[model samples]
Target: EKMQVLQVLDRLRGKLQEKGDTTQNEKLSAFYETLKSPLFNQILTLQQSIKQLKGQLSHIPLEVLFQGPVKILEIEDLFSSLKHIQHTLVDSQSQEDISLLLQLVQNKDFQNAFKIHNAITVHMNKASPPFPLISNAQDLAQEVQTVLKPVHHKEGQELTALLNTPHIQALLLAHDKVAEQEMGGGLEVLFQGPALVEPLGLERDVSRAVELLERLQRSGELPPQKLQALQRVLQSRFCSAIREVYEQLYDTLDIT
Candidate 1:
């Protein structure tokens, strides 16, 4: 840079000399003469006794590349390795590496290669908080046009499971009347249920439960098969609890 500055100065001086009539030329010539005067030569002695200034150091990667370096990017490999390294650091819970990744995650290109080997990352699961780096889905709902809309269960699947229950299945197989009324059954009607409740009364809870189950599925947390299995287990346990409460309440609360 200093050398370039001197070169520019030299050119400017020559141009000015050509344009000058007298005084400007003389003034500029005198300045250059003083700068390069033979009589003005002075030797500053270098006094270094030790001549030693080497220990351990490294060139900064950023600056080291400035001279002439090729930057090769493996977009896929980057997110792949980043997954292991970031999670390894996350496991240490120093909260160091993941934090580093998150802070550095301003680059969307960075996560495109983030393959999922574990449970659903928000990226794989949901659209908001689009990248798994930050789970600000709820926060984003307010600003961005994000909706955590409920995913209703498919009616066919619901009815199949309902009819497949042993007694209901056997009863329906025998009577056939149940199927006669099955087709119109949908969100078109408020579903209700079990003897005391008449399948109709249970619509809201069933809708909520199935909707929630599907939300988990849609969120990419679980597949439909897994969600269905879990839902059955859940409903089973719920019925068990209800029956226990019923036994305890039925006799005592008899409206005698």
Candidate 2:
């Protein structure tokens, strides 16, 4: 009668005996018999396993991941969760417990479920961008071409013709398409405020074109008159504004 329930049963049995209740005494004996049966042992074993599993899981650092509104799921956050669980499993008291944890870690279904959980959590909490990356690239290109059109220099015609090429047209179109796609799925609708981030790729390309024009001037391929016209086209307000936007964006983030 070391177990509390056994002690209770013994006291209850004594009471039945004291009452001279033969029918109740027999029933009490049957209860004791069932308590010692294999089914009862299995039930105890099942309960202990449940307790052990919960104990192990309680060590995981889930609180670290969900301390607030999870705006992002960083690599360190993932590592911390896995490392905590691993430490708990490694410190398990028995071989059986260790193997059970190992089995859980090795389970393909468990891995897939975790992967899905991570992706869904990140996607659900991710902040939508207020603006698309290259939404105004085509507009800027058209504005630059308009400014270049009235100049009489042959270099002006050359610059206009270069911007009119199928390659540049297709590139700008593709950039806009990608930007639009990124802004889709209702993200832009949710965040309509002006973007804090300035666009980059096309602005960088304009700066590079200016550098290439300088190179052409150095190589003597462009006369001073031609160089001046092309330089004016490359340094137009639209082109310079985009480049300045890139610089200001970089400066804001201390990105050099």
What lDDT does each candidate get? 0.33, 0.44
TM-score for each of the candidates: 0.16, 0.25
Candidate 1 per-residue lDDT over residues 1-256, each given as its tens digit: 4333234335444544454423333333433332232221110010112224232212212222222112222334443443544433323432443354344333432222121111112112232321121222113212211122233435434533443344332222222222234543212111122323333323344445456655556666324554554345334433323333333343344545
Q: Which ten residues in a row are the worst by lDDT in model 2?
A: 186-195
Which residues of candidate 1, in runs, are more than 4 Å off? 1-203, 219-229, 237-252
Clashes of 2: 0
Worst 10-residue lDDT window for candidate 1 reads: 39-48
lDDT string for model 2 (165-256, tens) is: 54344444444544565544321221123222233544554455555546546655334444445455446553343344444444556635
lDDT of 1 at 35: 25
Error (Å) of candidate 2 at residue 60 is 23
